[PDB]
Design a binder for this molecule. Structure first.
Ligand code: NAD
Ligand code: NAD
Ligand code: TDX
Lengths: 346, 346
């Protein structure tokens, strides 16, 4: 149904996985990646697949003149570009305001001008926090104990705040101006090409570099893990078959606490169970996230394929091990940045 | 009276100027610095009588970080009214709404964080979206979820209401993440003296005084919950001085009416025939019914509205616009010409 799509943020983790998906499975589609190449953008994520199907344009989603030139030639925008890290947002919120809110607005106005399709990629963090399962009457399976499409927005941080704000203007542009938009809110992704500032890759690559893994407080927090490959298929389903104006939740029923994830990484890599450091906990830290993906399953027939987390994590560890040249140049700098605000608890 | 040097942003507009007069007359220990950009909606005449040693007007933008810093360094609280406030202007040109409502709120929040001072965010019932009419509700407007509460989901409809909702979300995230000392109020439709003639009630009153037909959008079945600006002022004062840090309070006076009935009352009170008006082009995405349950504010802080007789409040408002024609006569032609660009008689 689309032949010339713009993928914003396609040189990053999840966005580049999506571009690979289209290159492999839909070779009749042309992709134009629009990416600013911040600290998180990486030409190596796309270099081997650039050609007649995929092109890279370096620039800012808030650059209205550039966005206009690109949108005049496209039939859809799939929007991943964002500042994506909670810890960076606590240290300096400025680029989150610019990219996440002003950038989304700029893209919406182009979609309105050219009357083209727009899919907004977003997060479960817009809904805030939930209690741990041991503290709920239905132990996580009762009404209201997971997020649904009817859950109230209640974000906790400058990152999650600016994401939620962007979701709200998308929805208002549909009602007020008839923009052809859909929204997705997905749980925590993992897999190859994730930046080493994030939880799973940071621990794996610390171990590879002879550095201790780092756990925030005692590791009680719970995240709902989904493989990026499954997020790609979900977005493709919503883009091509979704109902205009609707919000869809994406998740794979994969809740784990941070302590248990770290213990699995240590064991898989041959390290002792206690070979890690407890570090300064995150201001305003969100407790538990959990997604009920019944609407997407029911309506569009999407099913996740990578539901064995043990096997998915094993393949992820092997990828970081086999591609050390992809991350080694960033290790010292990322760890030094964290050292400015985190220390070992003792 | 815990706060002795406050900043009131947007204090040269309708509701903000009414609040500054309330402070001058009722809290003589408070010095007020107004920060106002004087857009088409700002008017020094709304403040002139009380300008002097107790109230200063500083002309500038809430998005100018350098100016905001200089003022915040001398203050012990910020009460934030500055906004682009009109749904119709937001549909014609969303640009100033993005700049003022979102970037402006962000800039003020960063100053409150820097100086560790109290911040009260003034917002609207429109952040919650729309409700059905009472005749179409199983509880006739009296059941759970048939009026807005502090637990109601955000679901804004327009560029105006979505930028306001977005600003509310960052305020709450700055509280959880950084400990900013903020409260939020969400109020229903205000009326009274000093309201800009682009708005519903003053537009009809002044059109009649000028020899022009009033204008009703579609059949006028839409419902708004009217509160006198004087009661909004006492509500904000209560929340500023006694509210629980981080909480939202709703302000309303149980005054729901449809637009047609309000227009008919104006016509009757001004000695005009009941059919002496035009139906005109309806608003894109028009919100149907708004309604506020103000229980939380009444029960926890002891506030009660004093102007509960709408007929009498409207009578006094008509008299004000009649006695102060010099305050608005020069703006009439331009406001009506702007509306003619997008509104025709139907
Ligand atoms: N990572 C997750 O678990 C997760 C889950 C659900 C949703 N999301 C959302 O998915 C999207 C991508 O997340 P990710 O983890 O790949 O992020 P990432 O940090 O790996 O990549 C972000 C990309 O955006 C680019 N970028 C930043 N600012 C830009 C700007 N102004 N103009 C153009 N490009 C810009 C960067 O160069 C980078 O390539 C984001 O919208 C995020 O909120 C992430
Ligand atoms: N009018 C209502 O029924 C209603 C109800 C609830 C809350 N609100 C909110 O109350 C507040 C005041 O509304 P109002 O009806 O008095 O609006 P208004 O249009 O009468 O006044 C807006 C004021 O803000 C100033 N301003 C605009 N942009 C600015 C900027 N960037 N920097 C500094 N000043 C700027 C204008 O000069 C003007 O004096 C708004 O935040 C609005 O969202 C309105
Ligand atoms: C100007 C105008 C309005 N209307 C209708 C539209 C609305 O249903 C109603 C009120 O219109 P507005 O004065 O534009 O107010 P509203 O859109 O309800 O928003 C107001 O209250 C909420 C506040 O947040 C907002 O700032 C304020 O402008 O009357 C008419 O029928 N005829 C008119 O000429």
């Amino acid at each position: 149904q689309f032949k010339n799509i713009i993928v914003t943020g396609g040189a990053g983790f999840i966005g580049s996985n999506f571009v690979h998906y289209v290159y492999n499975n839909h070779p009749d589609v042309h992709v134009t990646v629009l990416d600013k190449l911040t600290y998180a953008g990486n030409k190596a994520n796309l270099e081997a697949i650039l050609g007649d199907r995929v092109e890279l344009v370096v620039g800012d989603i808030a650059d209205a003149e550039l966005v206009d030139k690109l949108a005049a030639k496209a039939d859809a925008i799939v929007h991943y570009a964002a500042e994506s890290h909670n810890d960076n947002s606590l240290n300096d919120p400025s680029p989150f305001i610019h990219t996440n809110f002003i950038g989304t607005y700029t893209l919406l106005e182009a979609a309105r001008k050219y009357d083209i399709r727009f899919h907004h990629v977003s997060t479960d963090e817009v809904y805030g926090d939930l209690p741990l399962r041991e503290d709920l009457p239905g132990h996580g399976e009762g009404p209201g104990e997971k997020f649904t499409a009817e859950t109230n927005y209640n974000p906790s941080s400058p990152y999650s705040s600016t994401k939620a704000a962007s979701d709200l203007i998308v929805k208002a542009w549909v009602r007020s101006f008839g923009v052809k938009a859909t929204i997705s809110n997905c749980s925590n992704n993992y897999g190859p090409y994730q930046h080493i500032e994030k939880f799973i890759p940071r621990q794996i690559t610390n171990i590879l570099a002879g550095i201790k893994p780092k756990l925030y407080g005692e590791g009680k927090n719970v995240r709902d893990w989904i493989h990026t490959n499954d997020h790609s298929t979900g977005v493709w389903a919503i883009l091509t078959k979704g109902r205009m104006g609707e919000t869809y939740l994406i998740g794979a029923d994969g809740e784990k606490n941070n302590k248990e994830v770290l213990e699995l990484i240590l064991e898989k890599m041959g390290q002792p169970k206690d070979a890690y450091d407890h570090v300064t906990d995150r201001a305003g830290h969100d407790l538990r996230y959990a997604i009920d993906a019944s609407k997407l399953r029911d309506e569009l027939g999407w099913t996740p394929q990578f539901t064995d987390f043990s096997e998915g994590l094993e393949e992820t560890i092997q990828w970081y091990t086999d591609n050390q040249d992809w991350w080694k140049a960033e290790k010292e700098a990322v760890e030094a940045n964290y050292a400015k605000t985190q220390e070992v608890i003792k």
